[PDB]
A paper describes a structure:
Ceg10 is an uncharacterized effector secreted by Legionella pneumophila, the causative agent of human Legionnaires’ disease. We found the uncharacterized L. pneumophila-encoded Ceg10 protein to reproducibly break viral restriction in LD652 cells. We then used limited proteolysis to produce a core Ceg10 central domain (T55-R287) that was amenable to structural determination by crystallography. Overall, Ceg10TR is composed of 8 α-helices surrounding 7 β-sheets in a conformation resembling a cysteine proteinase with a putative catalytic triad consisting of Cys-159, His-196, and Asp-204.
All crystals used for data sets in this study were grown from the same batch of purified protein, but the crystallization condition for data set 1 was 2.0 M sodium, potassium phosphate whereas for data sets 2 and 3 the major precipitants were polyethylene glycols. In the S-nitrosothiol structure, the carboxylate of Asp-110 is hydrogen bonded to both the nitrosyl oxygen of C159 and the sidechain of Trp-206. In the S-nitrosylated structure, Asp110 also hydrogen bonds to the nitrosylated-C159 and van der Waals interactions occur between the aromatic ring of Trp206 and the nitrosylation moiety. These data together indicate that Ceg10 harbors a highly reactive catalytic cysteine that may be critical for regulating host responses to infection. To date, of the >215,000 structures available on the Protein Data Bank, only 43 deposits display an S-nitrosothiol group, highlighting the unique nature of this modification. Furthermore, to our knowledge, Ceg10 is the first structurally characterized S-nitrosylated Legionella effector.
Residue numbers in the entry: 57 to 247, 254 to 284
The structure:
């Protein structure tokens, strides 16, 4: 029985994977870019500790467990007493702890993981940008790589020309719309783009209370 809740067909997933392979086979990375690329591949693997229910390869019976994470995420996103960064990180933590979540939750998880890693001295992580094709969330790292933990795919982006790879791989997925970002100066932005000074003020507490001392969000090979 195919997964009746699949949001993409097997054919659609295969076509995206083939385009990602085309991009990756054509890129050559320098030594520092290769280090970040390896971190990105590792982070996408760690995101597979979270199961979705909306891929054609997923188990339809996991929909009721994903739903518990989705209820929490919806309640959290609607709260008026939390910053946007806190909401995103709370959902990342709930999704990783439960083991269930779809593309939004898995993108939030990798955002949280890489934000934690960015606190280390001379981390190669400098900017993080969550963005969406309609409801399909992805993460752009350093304006140089795109990560899709839902599909366990990633690829580099041409400098000064990132729409080349994005427009090829995600042709027919629609316009990419920003959701939340942190730049190299530590400034936070929501989506037109609006600065989010409350998340900036809250950044240290978000990192401490939701990310620190959780084996989930810590990497050691680096
Ligand atoms: Cl790092
Ligand atoms: Mg870089």
């Amino acid at each position: 029985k195919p997964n009746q809740y699949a949001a993409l067909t097997h054919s659609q997933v295969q076509e995206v994977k083939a385009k990602v392979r085309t991009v990756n086979d054509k890129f050559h990375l320098n030594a520092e870019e290769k280090k970040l690329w390896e971190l990105i591949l590792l982070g996408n693997q760690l995101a597979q500790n979270i199961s979705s229910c909306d891929l054609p390869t997923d188990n339809e019976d996991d929909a009721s467990l994903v739903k518990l994470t989705q209820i929490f995420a919806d309640e959290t996103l609607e709260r008026t007493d939390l910053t946007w960064l806190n909401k995103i990180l709370k959902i990342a933590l709930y999704s990783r702890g439960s083991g269930f979540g779809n593309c939004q939750e898995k993108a939030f998880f990798v955002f949280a993981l890489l934000l934690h890693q960015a606190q280390k001295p001379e981390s190669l992580i400098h900017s993080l940008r969550l963005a969406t094709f309609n409801n399909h969330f992805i993460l752009i790292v350093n304006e140089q790589f795109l990560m899709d933990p839902w599909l366990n795919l990633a690829f580099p982006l041409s400098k000064g020309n990132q729409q080349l790879e994005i427009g090829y791989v995600f042709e027919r997925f629609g316009r990419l719309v920003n959701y939340f970002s942190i730049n190299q100066e530590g400034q936070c932005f929501t989506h037109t783009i609006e600065r989010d000074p409350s998340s900036e003020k809250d950044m240290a507490n978000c990192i401490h209370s939701l990310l620190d001392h959780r084996d989930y969000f810590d990497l050691s090979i680096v």
